[PDB]
Every structure is written in C-alpha cells, then in structure tokens.
Design a protein around this nucleic acid. Structure first.
Ligand code: 1IH
Ligand code: MN
Lengths: 411, 555
DNA sequence: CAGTCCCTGTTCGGGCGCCG
DNA sequence: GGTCGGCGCCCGAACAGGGACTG
C-alpha cells in the first residue's frame, strides 16, 4: 500500500538489451528456487516475449557464506538512468568514513523488497533464466519491488532509511553511516570489540523494521605503494639503462626528474654486464630523485564530476600493483596487493579479488566505482570472472594489452 | 470468430510507423491453386477472415513445397511489416544437444500439427496483416484476407509460440515434476524413469492436457518405439548419432557449393572427429562472386578426400552420465587448427569439435591452446552446465613457465598432461638478466614517411657495426629489421638493446607464428640461439650506443 | 603542438549448415 | 522458393585506439 516514486529513463535512450550468458548447473538451480520463492512473495512475476528489454542474471556466495545470493547485471540499466540517482535524490558522501579505524559492510538488500516499484519502469527490469542444454526456452520474470543492485533503489529508499537510522544516529552521533547500493558502510573509531557490538545493535535495530551480514575493513591501515628506486652498491650498464628508462617514465608524473648526469655515464658503447662507477654528479642526481618520489604529486586532487579510472599490473609471484586516477599521470592512489586468494595457481581469481578490493576502497574514499583497465584478454575474462565474484556490485571495465615497459611500480 | 483457449500476447507497431501497403507479387498458376486451396480451408476453421476496403494495408504472399509431402506451406513476405513492428526478445537461447540427455527408462516423441495455426494473434494487430491473393485473372480484384493466428513469416510468431507453449506445459510440469520435457518449438521429447505401464498413461494425460488448449498430438507423428528421430538425430536406448549427411559431388565447383560443403562439414564435426576445413575455407578468401566457378587446389582436394573417408565409417555418440566425471581432450591437428573430443568413458565420445580461429597477427601454440579451451568450456556449460576436466598436449612445466611470466592474466581449469605429439611447447625463452660474455648490440631503425626509405643497423661493445639501406619500408619495419640483423651477425648468446616499444612487445609475447614475413625470420633466428636478452631504452636521451646508432640510421 | 599513418584488435554485415 | 526466429562457422569491410614522428 506504498506509493511508487515515478522514474524515467534519461532522455533519448532505450532500455538495456543485453543477452543472458550461459550459467552453470548450481547457479540455475539456485535461481529457480529463489525466483519461485520471490514469485510466491509477490516480489517478481512472469512476463512474455513482448518485452524487448533484458538483463543478465547470475548467483554468488559472499565470503564465508553458504547461502546463494541472486545478482543482476544492471550496469547497462544504471548507465541509462543516471540522471535520477545523482540530480534528484543524491546521497552525500561522508569524507570521514575513510579515516575510521574500522568499517563494516552489511547486506541490507533485503529491505528493498518492502517498497513497490514504479509500474511504468517495470518494463526495463526484465531478466531471463537459462536452462541446461536449453531444455526449455527462457523462463522470464520482472521485478515488482525495488530490485537488488539497481542505482535507483537506495535513492528511493533513502527517505525511509534516514528515519530508520535517526533513532540510532541520535544515540550514536560519532558513528558514520554510508549507504552504497545493497551495502551499508558503518565506520567508528571504537575498539574492535565494542565496534562489533554496535553492529549487532544495528542488526536488531534493522530487524524490527523488516530486514544480515558482516565484513570488516580497516581503512586507517590502507597504505600506498610509492615508486621506489633500487639501492645497490655496484651498478652495471644494464642497471643504469633500466634506471634511466624508469626515471624517464616517472618524469611524466614528477616534472622535477632529470637523467642528464646518468646519461653521461652511458657515453661509450659499453657491454651491458660491464660495471660502471658512479660519478660524483650522478650519485647526487640519484639521491635527489629518490626524495622527489617521496613527495606527493603537485596539483593532484579529486574531481566529483570526472570519472574514476583504475589500472592493474600483474607483477608475478602473487604481486599486483594498481593506480587510481581521473587524469593521466595524476594518480589519486597507488598500491600493491599480495598473497591474495589463488596466489601462484590462478590469475583470474586474483584479478577478480583485486577488482573487488580496489572497488571497495573506491566506495570508502570517494563513493564512486572506477572503470577498470584490466590486463586480460576479453574472452579469458568473460568466461571465468563470475566464478569468483563475491560482491553485490559490479564495476565497469575494458581490456588492454600493454607489454611491460620498464617496471615503474614494482621493483 | 470464437475465442481461443490460449492467452494472447499484446503487440504494437513501433511508434510513428503505419502498417505495410506494398504490392503483391505475380504468382504461378500452380501456386495460386495451392494457395486458394489453403486460403479457403483456413477460412473455414477461423484462421483467416476477409476484409473490405476499410483495411488500407497490403503485403505480399507466396508458397513453397513442404518436405516429403504433397501439402504446400503458406508464407507471408512481411519484410515491410517486420521493419515497423516492435522489437521482441527471443527466448530460445540455444539448440539442445543429445549429449546432454540422461538415460531415461521410457522415451516418447511427438510433433503437433500446424503449430503456428493453433495459437492466436493479438486482436488490435490483425489489421496490419492485410494481403491480397491474385486470382488466375489479372483483372479479378482478388480476395483480401487478414490473419487471425501467427503468420508463418512474421518475426514475432516463433517467439510468441515458444512462450505460450511453456505456459501450457507448466501446469503439467508442476503436477509431473519428474517428467523431463525437452521443449523446442512444437517437438516434445518426453522421458521418464517410471515403468513403461505408467509411461503411456502420462503420455495420454499430456495428449489430453495439450488437447484442452487446442494442441493436437497426431498418432501419425507419435513415436513410441526406438530409434526416435529428434532434432536430426537417431536416439537409441544406449547410443545416438546424426542423421545421414549428404555432400555435393560437383565436377565444376562454384563458391556456393563450397559454402554448402563447408557448412555441412562443420555440422558433421560434432560427432565425426578429425574434420578439417582449413584449405577448403582458403578458397573463399577474397572471392568476388557467389556463383563464380573456382578450381579446387591440390591441398583442397586432399582435404575433401579425407573427410569423405571419415564420413564412410559409422560413428555414434553417448549420453551424459552425471555420476562419472566429464573429460575433454585436445590435439594439434594443423598450423592454426585444433580438434577436441568430450567423453566420460574412453573412446565413448559424447561429442567432438574443432577450433581454428586465428586471433591477431602474432601468436603461439600456447595462446591458441588457451583460446580453444575457452571455446570448449563455454560449449560444455551450455550443454551440461559444468566445466570438463582437460587432457592437454602441453607439459605441466611448459604451461607453468608461460602463465607465470606472461603479463596478461591467463589460466586453465583443472587439467592433466597427456603425451600425445605434437606437444605444445615454447620454442625459445628470453633471458631475464643480461648475459655475461655476450656481445651487446645497440640497434635502432628509422625511415622517412614520404620516401619510404630507411636504414637499420647496430653498434657493439667489440667495435662491430653495420647499416643497411631499405626500400618500401616504415619506421616499425626498420626497427624490427635492425633486430633481425643483430641476430644474424651475433654468436649463440647475444644482448640486444633497442629503443622501439613496438618491437620489444611483439617478441616478449614469445610468438612462434606470424602474418608478417619479417617476424617469421626473426622467430627463426631466435630458436637457433641458446641465450637471448632484450632491453629497452628511451631514444634521443644520449644512451650508450643507442645515440650513436640513432645518428647512423638517421637518414 | 595537433596532424598524420603504421599497426593491431574489434565489431558487424552476409553467405551456408542445422532445427522448428 | 526467395518468410520468420534461434545457434554455429568463415570472410572482408568498417570501426577505433594507441605510438612514433612532424608543421
Ligand atoms: N521453412 C519454414 N518457414 C516458416 N516456418 C516454418 C518452416 N519450417 C517449419 N516452420 C514452422 C512449423 N511448420 C509446421 C507445418 P508447415 O511446415 O506446413 O509450416 C508446423 O507448424 O508444425
Ligand atoms: Mn509440427
């Protein structure tokens, strides 16, 4: 008996038309059950082929969670309704969330099923369940309530959410609460013990209004990976050559980098393994450039209007470096992930884990999700990526193939 | 007109476009008889209705012969209606395959008569389905009808039928959960593990549940005895195989007969193993006409004779046993060709196939082997919903060395080594640190964008040198040519330093084949070597011998 | 500097097969 | 004959985006 918030597509845009990709057996059975249940609870209803819109669907298991979780790839729909959840009913981003000692994530997607959706907008929420070996044609449905994974869901529910959080935000005014998609980010500087207590205080505070999860973060313990130069005592011609190429590639970021004196050490057509002594002027050009790499870049600052972009470099031996930027050579954050899941046995699982860890930091620090430049073939990624996804959101990406230049990020 | 027992599907035209108003084709007198014979009969059953001048629309119509029957099929040329009809989302996500079927105690197959003519069309749409039937006289005004059901030839008819069919089968599938009903258009594979007595009971139960909605299951099309004929296969209680495949034997081959041949060769590759269409598809490249006669090449006539001998012997597939694991094994047939077989018990093939796509100019067997596994993995999940275990002709250490060093992300599912030559291996390895006691070559290339001329050479630490004039070249061709020279005039261990990013990248991807001849020559010299080390330096920065050679090949 | 072109990878349009 | 839809393959032509060099 709740009134529907009317929504419209962005002007001059048709709904998403994305084909459903093949799914494994355990996922199709997990969807048939959840869709049979959600159809019985009036959350969804079957449709027909008169609907020209469609959206992929698949299921996941969150970290250390046995229950299957339905997930919809609403990326093409969120790109076509972007004017609604940024202009009319936007959510502010707390700048202090990234500074908290501990932040916890909660799957609050269950509450969105309590609010009905606009009737004229149910045409664009259509998805299709495939069958093994195409036993039956596509079993189609559409959403009758607020869908999990949409961008307009936390915007429509924002008014009801604030009134649920006020009895808790008043009792705890020093605690930061942020709502991004189907996740609720709660940050506090309390000790790790009483922090988990206030979580269960909110889990029961939300159950009495009609709603469970738990994933711990520590944003204060997030470090950056600076550009480091090797500290050797004996240098060869090849060492200095690799050093210059690395220092020249960095000179695009830090304009105060010079290689004049070092290039003078490479005057003769010398053998690579030949040891070259470091001149007096060169040993200082090496020390000064080490300090500039300690300094932060001049003129770098986040822009809310610009899109976030992130690149990932595979460094071997379970090492992965990443950078987040909006303009070229103006990096907002660098870093390095190590010994993730699938280390030394699966690259795709590591790359999937890295995209999740990076996207999580993007939500905490800026409230946006970056578009990814992924070091993997398009066909290699679109085959295995769903098998290791453990999040309720999905970022946008693209596929690159840049051979190694000169190691700029890892030693 | 009475009301159909099946729910109708609302259809609209695309906003801002009116129904079709196009002139009718002239029809042969043998087809006009076959049309009016079907036009007047469907009018009696309530499937088409006459219209007056209040219907300003018109669309063509014709008829073709039905396969193995004296009856004709009626079709409509809705090429102008379909353009202005709304877009539909199809539900048939793929074709079922017999390899995904599970052994069922009892099997039954039946095909309903006139499938599209048993499902109604939306009411508000039938006005745009106007057409004229030209009489035997060019002066007779003709009888203008309009459709009442799904017109064979409309772009929405198959999508509407498959959805309406599933909605009628749901009350039967909900009451009969253990009855596996493969639903493809109008054909229904019905299997069950019930005793053969209770089987025919559920058969008539469905044959009466389908009749309640206007779906007739003719005893002419009823099939209770194996072998069943399903989706162009033969289904026996233990084995299955494709229905016989007929290839043309033309003496003078045209381009169309190759496509008719190549197409049937790909259809046979699902159970008949070892089919190759590399040289036969090499006839279709750059060809201008469809009916142009093409003489068969010597390598093409051999490939055709081999595939004919493979089709001679009988082959058969098996069914999917969910208790035992799935296995897939690949072989390197030819340069750019691969074939694979999926099975559960040895030599008992579930299905076979081939992968031969050439991606990019520069590739290696390990790159192609990965591309083939992904093509198989997607194919398997479509049919069985799982990833098969792989037996690959690549050493475990060979794959380990590749993916650990490769800068791209790459991975292969649970697999095991099989010693079946030719074994996929990396033909050369670039060293990671410079080689002591090896001559060091500083190479660079340069060319003029207008003259298409350039130089390419090197300087060494032992005083060696060379520069070569080049014609009809680019800046990139020179930079590779500068490396090809350094590899020619060096010993068995060589250090090479270039300032070309384009060259370093292609080589580090350890390619063993390429479309460019210069790359194939560079690959060849690399395999002869024992140790090779590459490095990159920024040009025009006064580096070692890189500047000296940037000024030697400057012109 | 913006303007190229050299090279490489992708996307789509168009034939046949197969099924109904 | 020259209808629709699905899926598959192979080809060329069109599209596109990055890297070196140039007014
Ligand atoms: N070449 C074709 N063009 C259009 N539609 C076709 C077709 N082949 C089969 N269908 C649908 C099923 N048709 C039969 C009866 P018919 O073959 O007389 O149409 C049925 O409805 O069961
Ligand atoms: Mn039929």
């Amino acid at each position: 008996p709740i009134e529907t918030v009317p929504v419209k597509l962005k002007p001059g845009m048709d709904g998403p038309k994305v084909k459903q990709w093949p799914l494994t057996e355990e996922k199709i059975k997990a969807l048939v059950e959840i869709c049979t249940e959600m159809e019985k609870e009036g959350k969804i209803s079957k449709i027909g082929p008169e609907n020209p819109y469609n959206t992929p669907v698949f299921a996941i298991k969150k970290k250390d969670s046995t229950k299957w979780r339905k997930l919809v790839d609403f990326r093409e729909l969120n790109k076509r309704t972007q004017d609604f959840w940024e202009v009319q009913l936007g959510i502010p981003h707390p700048a202090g969330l990234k500074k908290k000692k501990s932040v916890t994530v909660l799957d609050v997607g269950d509450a969105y099923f309590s609010v009905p959706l606009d009737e004229d907008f149910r045409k664009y929420t259509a998805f299709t369940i495939p069958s093994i070996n195409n036993e039956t044609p596509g079993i189609r449905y559409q959403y009758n309530v607020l869908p999990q994974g949409w961008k307009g869901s936390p915007a429509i529910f924002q008014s009801s959410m604030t009134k649920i959080l006020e009895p808790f935000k008043k009792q705890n005014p020093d605690i930061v609460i942020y709502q991004y998609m189907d996740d609720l980010y709660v940050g506090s500087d309390l000790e790790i013990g009483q922090h988990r207590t206030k979580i269960e205080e909110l889990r029961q505070h939300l159950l009495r209004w009609g709603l469970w999860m738990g994933y711990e973060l520590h944003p204060d313990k997030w470090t950056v990976q600076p550009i480091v130069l090797p500290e050797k005592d004996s240098w060869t011609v090849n060492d200095i050559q690799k050093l210059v190429g690395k220092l020249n590639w960095a000179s695009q970021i830090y304009p105060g980098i010079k290689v004049r004196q070092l290039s003078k050490l490479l005057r003769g057509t010398k053998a690579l393994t030949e040891v070259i002594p470091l001149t007096e002027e060169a040993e200082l050009e090496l020390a000064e450039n080490r300090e500039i790499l300690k300094e932060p870049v001049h003129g770098v600052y986040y822009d809310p209007s610009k899109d976030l972009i992130a690149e990932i470099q595979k460094q071997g031996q379970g090492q992965w470096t990443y950078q987040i930027y909006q303009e070229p050579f103006k990096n907002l954050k660098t870093g390095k992930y190590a010994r993730m899941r699938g280390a030394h046995t699966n690259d795709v699982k590591q790359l999937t884990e890295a995209v999740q860890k990076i996207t999580t930091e993007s939500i905490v620090i800026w409230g946006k999700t970056p578009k990814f430049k992924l070091p993997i073939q398009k066909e290699t990624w679109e085959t295995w990526w769903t098998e290791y996804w453990q999040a309720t959101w999905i970022p946008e990406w693209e596929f690159v193939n840049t051979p190694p230049l000169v190691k700029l990020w890892y030693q | 007109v009475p009301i159909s027992p099946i729910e109708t599907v609302p259809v609209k035209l695309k906003p801002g476009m009116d129904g079709p108003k196009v002139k009718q084709w002239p029809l042969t007198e043998e087809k006009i008889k076959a049309l009016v014979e079907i036009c007047t009969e469907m009018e009696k059953e309530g499937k088409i209705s006459k219209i007056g001048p209040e219907n300003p629309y018109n669309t063509p119509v014709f008829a073709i012969k039905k396969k193995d029957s004296t009856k004709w099929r009626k079709l409509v040329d809705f090429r102008e209606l379909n353009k202005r009809t709304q877009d539909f989302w199809e539900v048939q996500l793929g074709i079922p395959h017999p390899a995904g079927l599970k052994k069922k105690k009892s099997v039954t197959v039946l095909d309903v008569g006139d499938a599209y003519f048993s499902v109604p069309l939306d009411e508000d749409f039938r006005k745009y389905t106007a057409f004229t039937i030209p009489s035997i006289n060019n002066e007779t005004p003709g009888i203008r009808y309009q459709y009442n059901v799904l017109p064979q030839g409309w772009k929405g008819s198959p999508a509407i039928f498959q959805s309406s069919m599933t909605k009628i089968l749901e009350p039967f599938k909900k009451q009969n959960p253990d009855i596996v009903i493969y639903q493809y258009m109008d054909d229904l594979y019905v299997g069950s593990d019930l005793e053969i007595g209770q089987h025919r009971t559920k058969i008539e139960e469905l044959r009466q549940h389908l009749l309640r909605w206007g779906l007739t299951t003719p005893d002419k099309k009823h099939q209770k005895e194996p072998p069943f004929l399903w989706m162009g296969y033969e289904l026996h209680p233990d084995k299955w195989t494709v229905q016989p495949i007929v290839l043309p034997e033309k003496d003078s081959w045209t381009v169309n007969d190759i496509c008719k041949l190549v197409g049937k060769l790909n259809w046979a590759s699902q159970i008949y193993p070892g089919i190759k269409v590399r040289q036969l598809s090499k006839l279709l490249r750059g060809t201008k006409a469809l009916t142009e006669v093409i003489p068969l090449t010597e390598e093409a006539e051999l490939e055709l004779a081999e595939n004919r001998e493979i089709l001679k012997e009988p082959v058969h597939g098996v069914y999917y046993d969910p208790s035992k694991d799935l296995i897939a094994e690949i072989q390197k047939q030819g340069q750019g060709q691969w074939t694979y077989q999926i099975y559960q018990e040895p030599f008992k093939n579930l299905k076979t196939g081939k992968y031969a796509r050439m991606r990019g100019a520069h590739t290696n067997d390990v790159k192609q082997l990965t591309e083939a596994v992904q093509k198989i993995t997607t194919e398997s999940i479509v049919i069985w919903g799982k990833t098969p275990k792989f037996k690959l002709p690549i050493q475990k250490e060979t794959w380990e060395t590749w993916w650990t060093e490769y800068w791209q992300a790459t991975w292969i599912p649970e697999w095991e080594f099989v010693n079946t030559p030719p074994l996929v291996k990396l033909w050369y390895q670039l060293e990671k640190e410079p080689i002591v006691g090896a001559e060091t070559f500083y190479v660079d290339g340069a060319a003029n964008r207008e003259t298409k001329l350039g130089k390419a050479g090197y300087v060494t630490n032992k005083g060696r040198q060379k520069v070569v004039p080049l014609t009809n070249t680019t800046n990139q061709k020179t930079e590779l040519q500068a490396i090809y020279l350094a590899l020619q005039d060096s010993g068995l261990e060589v250090n090479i330093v270039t300032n070309s990013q384009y060259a370093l990248g292609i080589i580090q991807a350890q390619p063993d084949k390429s479309e460019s001849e210069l790359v194939n020559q560079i690959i060849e010299q690399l395999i002869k070597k024992e140790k090779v080390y590459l490095a990159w330096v920024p040009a025009h920065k006064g580096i070692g011998g890189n500047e000296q050679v940037d000024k030697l090949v400057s012109a």
